[PDB]
Amino acid sequence: LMGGFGLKNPPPQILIKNTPVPANPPAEFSATKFASFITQYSTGQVSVEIEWELQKENSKRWNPEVQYTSNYAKSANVDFTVDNNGLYTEPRPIGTRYLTRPL
């Protein structure tokens, strides 16, 4: 109901954690397991590559259709670019229903 593709077997969840590396244990044994760990974190890169199957229009409409254009005007800030201090902003939501076809 939010829109999208309903999938019985969706893309599976990729779960990730840091392996716990404990600090120094005491000299004698104690079975109350571990509260002392080495405070750490990880970083890295992650790349996702989805292939999408397109469906071409077969339209026999005569007149021009409605497009998603950018307003060519004297603007202070370009749409869908970064700001004066590098904040990336998205000025409006873009749907996907622009082309037409008969019912």
Place this chain on the structure above:
Amino acid sequence: DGVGNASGNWHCDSTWLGDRVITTSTRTWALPTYNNHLYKQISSASTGASNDNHYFGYSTPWGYFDFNRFHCHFSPRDWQRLINNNWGFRPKRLNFKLFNIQVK
């Protein structure tokens, strides 16, 4: 091959292939008789023109086909589907046809 047999069909489609577009365009024409079949010579003496607009020429009883405008081949939709996602175009070859002639 006439009389009761058409010598061509109405082709007016526009197939957009990959790195090319083939535009076809059929029109119905009408050709009168010009000059009453004469080669009348035309000039600027009878007009009374300026020095810049003087001319000397010849008018013929012949017509001519011209398809030298872009809307003779592109619809407004096919023009929009041309100008918005192409960095260029040029014509490769044309193919002319003249058919279903009716002299009245």
